[PDB]
Amino acid sequence: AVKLGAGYETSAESWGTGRAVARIPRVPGGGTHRAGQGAFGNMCRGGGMFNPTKIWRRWGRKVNLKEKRYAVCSSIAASGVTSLVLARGHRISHLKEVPLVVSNDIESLSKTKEAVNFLVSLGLKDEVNRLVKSKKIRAGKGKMRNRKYKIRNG
Amino acid sequence: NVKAYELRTLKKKELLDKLDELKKELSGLRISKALGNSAKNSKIHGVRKNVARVLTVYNQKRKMELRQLYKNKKFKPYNLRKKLTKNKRLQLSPKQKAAMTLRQKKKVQNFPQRKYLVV
Amino acid sequence: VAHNNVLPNVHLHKWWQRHVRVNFSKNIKKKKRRLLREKRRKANGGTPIEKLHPIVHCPTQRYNFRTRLGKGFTFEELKGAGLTPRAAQTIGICYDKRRKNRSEESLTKNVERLLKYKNSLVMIPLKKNKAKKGIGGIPADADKNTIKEFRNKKPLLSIFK
Amino acid sequence: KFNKQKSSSRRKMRKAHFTAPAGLRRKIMSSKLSKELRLKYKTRSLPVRKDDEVLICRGHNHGREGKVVKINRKRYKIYVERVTREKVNGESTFIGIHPSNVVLTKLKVDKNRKKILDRKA
RNA sequence: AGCACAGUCUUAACGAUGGAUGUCUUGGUUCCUACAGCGAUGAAGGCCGCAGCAAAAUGCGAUACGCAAUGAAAAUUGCAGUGACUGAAUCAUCAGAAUGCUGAAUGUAAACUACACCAAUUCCCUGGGAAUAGUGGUACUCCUACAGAAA
RNA sequence: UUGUGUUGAAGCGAAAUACGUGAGUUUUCGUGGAACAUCUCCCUAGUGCAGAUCUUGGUGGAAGUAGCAACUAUUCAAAUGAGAACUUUGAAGACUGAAGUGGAGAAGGGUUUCUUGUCAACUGUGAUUGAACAAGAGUUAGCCGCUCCUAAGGGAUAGCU
RNA sequence: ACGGACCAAGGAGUCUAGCAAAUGUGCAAGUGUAUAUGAUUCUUUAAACAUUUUACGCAUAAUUAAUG
RNA sequence: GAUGUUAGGAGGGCAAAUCCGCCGAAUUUAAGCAUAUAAUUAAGCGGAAGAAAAGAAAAUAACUAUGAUUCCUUUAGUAACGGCGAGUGAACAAGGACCAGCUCAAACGGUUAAUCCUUCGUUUGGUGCAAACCUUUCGACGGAAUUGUCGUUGAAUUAUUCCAUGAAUGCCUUUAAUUUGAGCAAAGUGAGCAGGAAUGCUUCCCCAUAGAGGGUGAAAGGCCCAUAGUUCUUUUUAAUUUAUUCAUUGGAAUUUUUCAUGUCGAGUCGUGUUCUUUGAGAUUGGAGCACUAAUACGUGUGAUACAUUUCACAUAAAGCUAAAUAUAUGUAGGAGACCGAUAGCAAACAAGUACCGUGAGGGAAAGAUGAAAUAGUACUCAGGAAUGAGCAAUUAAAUAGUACCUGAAAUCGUUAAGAUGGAACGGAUUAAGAGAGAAAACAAGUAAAGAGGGGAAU
Ligand SMILES: [Mg+2]
Ligand SMILES: [Mg+2]
Ligand SMILES: [Mg+2]
Ligand SMILES: [Mg+2]
Ligand SMILES: [Mg+2]
Ligand SMILES: [Mg+2]
Ligand SMILES: [Mg+2]
Ligand SMILES: [Mg+2]
Ligand SMILES: [Mg+2]
Ligand SMILES: [Mg+2]
Ligand SMILES: [Mg+2]
Ligand SMILES: [Mg+2]
Ligand SMILES: [Mg+2]
Ligand SMILES: [Mg+2]
Ligand SMILES: [Mg+2]
Ligand SMILES: [Mg+2]
Ligand SMILES: [Mg+2]
Ligand SMILES: [Mg+2]
Ligand SMILES: [Mg+2]
Ligand SMILES: [Mg+2]
Ligand SMILES: [Mg+2]
Ligand SMILES: [Mg+2]
Ligand SMILES: [Mg+2]
Ligand SMILES: [Mg+2]
Ligand SMILES: [Mg+2]
Ligand SMILES: [Mg+2]
Ligand SMILES: [Mg+2]
Ligand SMILES: [Mg+2]
Ligand SMILES: [Mg+2]
Ligand SMILES: [Mg+2]
Ligand SMILES: [Mg+2]
Ligand SMILES: [Mg+2]
Ligand SMILES: [Mg+2]
Ligand SMILES: [Mg+2]
Ligand SMILES: [Mg+2]
Ligand SMILES: [Mg+2]
Ligand SMILES: [Mg+2]
Ligand SMILES: [Mg+2]
Ligand SMILES: [Mg+2]
Ligand SMILES: [Mg+2]
Ligand SMILES: [Mg+2]
Ligand SMILES: [Mg+2]
Ligand SMILES: [Mg+2]
Ligand SMILES: [Mg+2]
Ligand SMILES: [Mg+2]
Ligand SMILES: [Mg+2]
Ligand SMILES: [Mg+2]
Ligand SMILES: [Mg+2]
Ligand SMILES: [Mg+2]
Ligand SMILES: [Mg+2]
Ligand SMILES: [Mg+2]
Ligand SMILES: [Mg+2]
Secondary structure, X not given: OOOOOOOOOOOOEOOOOOOXXXXXXXOOOOOXXXXXXXXXXXXOOOOOOOOOOOOOOOOOOOOOHHHHHHHHHHHHHHHHOHHHHHHHOOOOOOXXXXXXXXXXXXXXXXXXXXXXXXXXXXXXXXXXXXXXXXOEEOOHHHHHHOXXXXXXXX | OOOHHHHOOOOHHHHHXXXXXXXXHHHHHHHHHHOOOOOOOOHHHHHHHHHHHHHHHHHHXXXXXXXXXXXXXXXXXXXXXXXXXHHHHHOOOHHHHHOOOHHHHHHHHHOOOXXXXXX | OOOOOOXXXXXXXXXXXXXXOOOOOHHHHHHHHHHHHHHHHHHOOOOOOOOEOOEEEOOHHHHOOOEEEOOOOOHHHHHHHOOOHHHHHHOOEOOOOOOOOOOHHHHHHHHHHHHHHXXXXXXXXXXXXXXXXXXXXXXOEOOHHHHHHHHHOXXXXXXXX | OOOOOOOOOHHHHHHHHHHOOHHHHHHOOEEEEOHHHHHHOOOOEEEXXXXXXXXXXXXXXXXXXXXXXXXXXXXXXXXXEEEEEEOXXXXXXXXXXXXXXXXEEEOOOOHHHHHHHXXXX
């Protein structure tokens, strides 16, 4: 949100008609370059933006619990289906079964290296490689806002 | 260039004497600067620092002496008193705050908030 | 106003923008509260944060049938339990000077509850080891082993609901 | 990362780097030690002092060993014995190397350094 | 050595003018969390100072871009100079010391560095020996206690 | 999601046997010197400009035009200097004409004073001049003032509002 | 008739509240887990998950000024 | 009662986002306007705190009843108010967060104020290097106070059981968290290409509880700082460990049994009347004035003025009190589907600065060379000098030369080509010029032998 009185902190008023100047509010006084300038109003340099953004915009959306549940279920189902998974972009051509289930021994893995090895063994070597490749620096101003890298979802 | 650890041991008169000498030296340097010189213009800074050090040492000694003089005795100079935010000074001491009307105290003693593990 | 719509009723003719609170703090606030309560629990080693409340019937013809936790137990109920008010307060139980009993049955129920609570609870001694019997209401202090055993078991919070 | 007391925030980090006090500067002009040195001491890397003898790895002089002449904490640059360079005038100045791009071989070793080594161990 | 009329208009190439676009970013903004007062023990605010070469800002207060102490810890550097081989050069820390003139401003004043009155005051040495017209104090309201006068 | 970049990204300039009805897209060459897309789907918005006597900044034609005409008036030689109608000296000729561009002060200004330098801009022509720029310097009181008295008046004390 | 010398950038139906219609979606005599709690929830997590081992809303019934 | 520069203390001013008091508008809406609305808002004046305020029932209910305040969800855009127009608009219950109760006054104790404070002291301790602090009980000498301090919360009396207490001997253990700064911290500075310079590209290695972020001559998990993780040390606060003897003053709770039926806040409530405020309606709160009560069988609420009377609920006119709650102020952190230098704070920069205004006030513009100026333009020639030029020079690059990244348009210059009888441009259609161009705008294959690259068969 923009700070509340942005562009409107001035005392400016319009000179009115008979001066051969548009009737935008003007900064008063003299001496500065700012004196006599178009003041508030979306058009003006140093003006307020149009509908200044406010904290009371609706940020979240309530989604029906049931709907959410349904969505979750459908995603699970999708994860099930090989073709869908493939479409979603994963390099899954070398995995046998796509409801891919692994023994509880996995829950005790202590070392990232071991995990990686396991993944490779499974058939996801290619996927892993892709993931490694695809850390790249974002286009645009995300770069300036702690969104430096863009990484594909494994 | 005299650093403080040497000076702590010295007596006050000696310190004073030292200080005067330093001041004289400083004055000389200033005079030189005023006259068309830049030979020992940069010497002045060190001298100044030395003087400051001496002053600090002496001042702390004086403060210590003052403290010794006014040890306890209820009232004291407002310097040697506990300089501390005014509000805090005003505020009731924790003990005072605690102090309980006798009945209340009795009650507390008798029926204190017990520990009682529910099962 | 135009067309067939509800006649507009929007109370925003005052400087409403001045006092809009948007609750960005909700979940985080909740978390903080939880943390605080945990801390409190820790401080009261073993003992429960929560205090015993009597079940009571809600007033008014419409909530009549429903029952919910009131504040505080009524002198009569305490007496029935075999308990002093001060003593009760000192333990985990709430006292309510202003509540009165019209119904015998209700009173009985709450004294039953109180009894149950008493049965449940085991009292840590005030000064260590030295086991002494209570004052007015409070039960006796158990020995060390028993206390340890109790600690090892789970602290039941079924009665406070 | 996982502790939320420290800030990831790029801007903040950059400010810290640029506006650091002298101690911080000293800490962040560290250099990798050679294999031999690593073997000797549990340490991986050290803050570089005056009379250390560095081998430059990156830059135009990828190989020239030399005794460090000066380290300059304003610009984050060490200067080395013979990495000389004429200005437009002719005056022969030293080329600055950032300590990333250097690996230190022979070690200046005062009591402080010894203490540091002990701590690392 | 020659030859283009000139001007106006147009197009292209190559420049000037200007600062758009794009790329940045020690800044802002919003939200979240946390604490939360300063002052007659002189506050905030304001002046005046203070550097070897020093205007601003920054920092500081006649010990004046800093003193002590603590934790780092060999440099600092435009030159001059000062330091190392750790109370030292530089950082951070900052609890000790100190904190000009003002300002509630409070001895009366105020476009005054004007003016009172009371203490003379201060330092050193273990009762003397030195300094300096310098230093404090004195507002109004109020409270408790004391005082000796009043009805 | 699946990609392009110092064997040169965005941008910009000019184009193109280019595609599209069109918004546009695409590519070439040049410059550029570091980022950039995603049309695979949809999410989001401070989302698209020829106008508002729009705002801001810049640039024109007008135009080398209007104009640089109150205060009677300059001239000769020499010096300084790269260079002199307007810097200096001399010689003329003039004016101000003691109700003065003369001496002193007040208000106001604040170092403009002074010497030595000196010319990027400024001194609406020039300029070596200067109230410009830079470096230094300069204001000395028992008697001249303020300081004291009271005036029109002001701010307060007691109360009282 | 008015505005527009030129150029660049900025520059105007937006956001909330509540109602409605439309359409999508879920569930359907129900529906919405509201505050709040709980979790082996804690870079993201200010989301996501969960709902205690007859809350309230709107709807499910209308009508009357009203006792009803 | 004055008086004191008496001894000791306090207030004053700054700051304000939240907060508490007053005071108090109007624009605005009603399509006019006057009550209403804006709004018990802005401004004004005063006052606090880390929160403030509120708060322990003269409460709500009419139930099977609840039980201080606050806050959230709701009740509810409802009851109600309102030129019954515009519009305004609560409360109880219900679900939660959080939960804490109390002490004055009055009653009682006179076989004695038991209270309280100032000054002067005295002597055991505890942490500290000191500085200071921390507590310990003991008197004096003053006062204050009978115009009322302290204890008791009716009073005694019994049975039970607690709590304080002093001395001797004894034990400073194990962890769990919690919160400060602390260190420690995995793995490549490997071949080749192109480059000023890899952090790049093909390729060979690994580490990962660390592939957050930043730095580094271009995109870096492995170059640096940090990051994951752990190791002490700081803060406190739980659990666990050791108490055992002996002294007695004092108190407490329930329990019997007697006797006491006490006390319960006055120019206050209340009514009238005025004005205000409220949704409050024959007045919701408040205030001014007049009048001015009752004692608990009283008086006050029970949303329509009254009488006569039930019933329920409370106990006004004194006071305190943590939590849940709020925060656009300040400081410090941390985040972002935010802005990216005409944006974002007015302010990315010596910004509340310069500058304007007598003044209250008004209030800008202005970021980027390069990796490195510890590469910021040496040298030579022409110049009075600025500058210019170079066979000279830093650079990867100077048409990156400090007005420095990119460098658009308007506008202007140079050159060329073209047109040109009081506009210019444009559309449709060719033409003539002048540029660009082969991806449809010809030639697959076969043969001869060069230069490459692949794939298979054994
Ligand atoms: Mg703005
Ligand atoms: Mg972009
Ligand atoms: Mg011609
Ligand atoms: Mg305060
Ligand atoms: Mg020091
Ligand atoms: Mg030290
Ligand atoms: Mg004064
Ligand atoms: Mg005067
Ligand atoms: Mg693009
Ligand atoms: Mg817009
Ligand atoms: Mg635009
Ligand atoms: Mg435009
Ligand atoms: Mg248009
Ligand atoms: Mg303009
Ligand atoms: Mg013009
Ligand atoms: Mg002239
Ligand atoms: Mg004459
Ligand atoms: Mg005349
Ligand atoms: Mg002069
Ligand atoms: Mg001129
Ligand atoms: Mg001169
Ligand atoms: Mg000057
Ligand atoms: Mg005189
Ligand atoms: Mg006088
Ligand atoms: Mg007078
Ligand atoms: Mg007056
Ligand atoms: Mg006309
Ligand atoms: Mg018109
Ligand atoms: Mg016009
Ligand atoms: Mg215009
Ligand atoms: Mg619908
Ligand atoms: Mg005040
Ligand atoms: Mg109207
Ligand atoms: Mg109207
Ligand atoms: Mg009107
Ligand atoms: Mg106000
Ligand atoms: Mg309070
Ligand atoms: Mg509510
Ligand atoms: Mg409703
Ligand atoms: Mg209202
Ligand atoms: Mg680069
Ligand atoms: Mg009463
Ligand atoms: Mg009203
Ligand atoms: Mg009622
Ligand atoms: Mg009360
Ligand atoms: Mg209160
Ligand atoms: Mg700006
Ligand atoms: Mg290159
Ligand atoms: Mg270029
Ligand atoms: Mg660049
Ligand atoms: Mg440029
Ligand atoms: Mg003609």
